[PDB]
Amino acid sequence: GAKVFAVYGKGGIGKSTTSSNLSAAFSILGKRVLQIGCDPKHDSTFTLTGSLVPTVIDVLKDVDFHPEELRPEDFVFEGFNGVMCVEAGGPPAGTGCGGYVVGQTVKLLKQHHLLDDTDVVIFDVLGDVVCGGFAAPLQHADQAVVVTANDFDSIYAMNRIIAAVQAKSKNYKVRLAGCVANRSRATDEVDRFCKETNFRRLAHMPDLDAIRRSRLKKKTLFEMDEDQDVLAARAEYIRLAESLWRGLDPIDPHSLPDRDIFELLGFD
Amino acid sequence: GAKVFAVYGKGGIGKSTTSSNLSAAFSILGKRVLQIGCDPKHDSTFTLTGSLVPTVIDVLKDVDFHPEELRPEDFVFEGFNGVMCVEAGGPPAGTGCGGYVVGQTVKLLKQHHLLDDTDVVIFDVLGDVVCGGFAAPLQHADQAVVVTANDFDSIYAMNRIIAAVQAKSKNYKVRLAGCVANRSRATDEVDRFCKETNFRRLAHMPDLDAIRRSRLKKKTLFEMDEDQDVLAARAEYIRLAESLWRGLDPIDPHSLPDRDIFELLGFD
Ligand SMILES: Nc1ncnc2c1ncn2[C@@H]1O[C@H](COP(=O)(O)OP(=O)(O)O)[C@@H](O)[C@H]1O
Ligand SMILES: Nc1ncnc2c1ncn2[C@@H]1O[C@H](COP(=O)(O)OP(=O)(O)O)[C@@H](O)[C@H]1O
Ligand code: SF4
Ligand SMILES: [Mg+2]
Ligand SMILES: [Mg+2]
Q1: FRET partner for B145 with CA separation of 20 to 30 A, picked from A16, A31, A78, A174?
Q2: Pocket mutation for ligand 1, best pick of A215, A221, A237 (most atoms within 8 Å of C-beta)
Q3: Residue-range domain boundaries for chain B
Q4: Contacts of A246 (CB under 8 A, 6+ apart)
């Protein structure tokens, strides 16, 4: 069966960058990949297709919320190097639960057996809250990965996401793999946090010109025109993908009481 | 009764900064003020009390979720110049609806008539999603204020918050006041968005070193050592408070489709 990953973190921290470049890396390693955007900011798969594909909510609206009329070709799109792409989108105005479209997406994935017949599945998920449809990927994932920077807000979110994932531990198989420290020069604060919680930093991606430009060219680092700066960034994504494919030794971390994050990071 | 304001926006954009300084401004203008933090990052009222006060979830836990047993003295705290402070906190992550504690907090406020016997109430609310308990303050607010900057993510969040507020406006008295452009030199993108949507910029707060420092020092701008910028910043918070108190003309904005925000801001 597929190895399934769920990527969480605060808004704007690099979830889609990390997910898309990981999907591209896995494809380069010879794996069949499916990436599912689970975020009301519906550009998860943008750099894989070079476009904003029709979203699950778009196509649901088109069949007047009779999802039984949909076929995979309506909402699953081929992107870079054969990476398959689904984009949930966000719920329309007034919608009760903010996760509803992610819930509808995960329903369709299971009904169409789309987690089968592939090697790697990556869910790219809003993590400012983890509940309802935003928690649905956890029922399917083997490993959860948190994207973080060194700032207070991203670490505080990471701590809450750790708690959310561990709260599922008796019901789901998903376990935490660790974090990707992203868009920062070094990792002092992330490492301080990891030491306190026995958590693991899986990778460090600096704030790279190559990456910012890739999004502006509507491409992944791997689809980009070759230059030197691209090569180093590519290598770290390949390394990270290799480690996740191979599997890591387990961690058994803990979340801190939320109050104690303020203390730990000098913000009380 | 009290004039009730609800402040929404993406995580880390300046909601608690705007709320706390607005509360301090109203207090200086001679108004009785209640600020309610409605955010899992539970430092909304930190700079008013100079400390992380006990949260509603703290005290709910202690009484084993029998809110019956609580009195206002258990969860309402005195801060700067008599500004009164409540801090919701968040629920244990991964166990239920992320909005649960905000929902319980709103119930407690109504139970104890805490909206009825003050002049100004300010809810400071997570707005990366607007659903469940996070939408509950909109059932009591007179005016909703969105904090934003010129960046894509905060404007995109503001767009979705507009739609959420207007959905509540069908069944509740709340209307949109407009946005506070925060931590930016100018308001070019914010104004482009406002022009397209018939929204309104109510105020603009530049990125000020004194504001960032104030959070570290655990106080509001109104207690910061004086200088040209700090005086201007105070004056702007006063002007905003004055405008909200006297009231502005009713506006009738429209949110855009998410896809159209990518187009408008050049991110597709
Ligand atoms: N390591 C990095 N170096 C440079 N830019 C980055 C990096 N990670 C993310 N970005 C940029 O930051 C912005 C937000 O990243 P994104 O992956 O879309 O965040 P999220 O999916 O968590 O909201 C994008 O413009 C993206 O290109
Ligand atoms: N106008 C501003 N100038 C300088 N710093 C600001 C400004 N607004 C907010 N900040 C800083 O940004 C950080 C996050 O602000 P905060 O109000 O806590 O955001 P939110 O409540 O939206 O999560 C804080 O460290 C705060 O001091
Ligand atoms: S479960 Fe989560 S996403 Fe759904 S209403 Fe509650 S806070 Fe919103
Ligand atoms: Mg994203
Ligand atoms: Mg806040």
Answers
A1: A16
A2: A215
A3: 1-268
A4: none
